[PDB]
């Protein structure tokens, strides 16, 4: 199958619920505190300070409209954006476990939830089309990292070097 040992629905699916994760973002802001890579087609090159908030809950499509803040080398200050995100299935799952980001002009990019709890996610970025493979970590409070997600993130990102993404310094 060419997939990570953690993509195992029978074992891990109760903690890999993307649709529930997308909707959590409607009630609370999510911030990307750490990642293991620096160039993404969605975030940009040398990205930092990524966070999100969501609206336009569509149960039929399992999609939301996401508003991102983020920083990359395209500009010196905070940038904003709007994209559609849809909960989809990857690695042979019965139940949606993946984030399909869609740009206005139809570009699609899909990341997989490796692990999630009510206030955090660990998100995997397969990196195909020659992109960078790595891991992300998100929480509802950039000052406070939930330990289960951190634990899972350090485990799954083993052998990779970690770096900060959204810290307090982002909002001076």
UniProtKB/Swiss-Prot annotation:
GO MF annotations, alphabetized: amine binding
Reported function: Salivary tick protein that acts by scavenging histamine at the wound site, outcompeting histamine receptors for histamine, thereby overcoming host inflammatory responses. Binds histamine with a high-affinity (Kd=1.7 nM). Contains two binding histamine sites (H and L), that appear to bind histamine with differing affinities (high and low).
The protein's name: Female-specific histamine-binding protein 2
Keywords: Disulfide bond, Secreted, Signal
Pfam families associated with the record: His_binding (PF02098)
Complex and partners: Monomer.
Localization annotation: Secreted
Provenance organism: Rhipicephalus appendiculatus
GO terms classed as biological process: symbiont-mediated perturbation of host defenses
S-S bonds: 49-170, 120-149
Residues reported to bind histamine 2: 21, 25, 99, 101, 121, 138
GO cellular component: extracellular region
Tissue specificity of this protein: Expressed in salivary glands.
InterPro entries: Calycin, Tick_his-bd
Protein family according to the UniProt entry: Belongs to the calycin superfamily. Histamine-binding salivary protein family.
Residues holding histamine 1: 21, 37, 40, 43, 83, 109, 121, 136
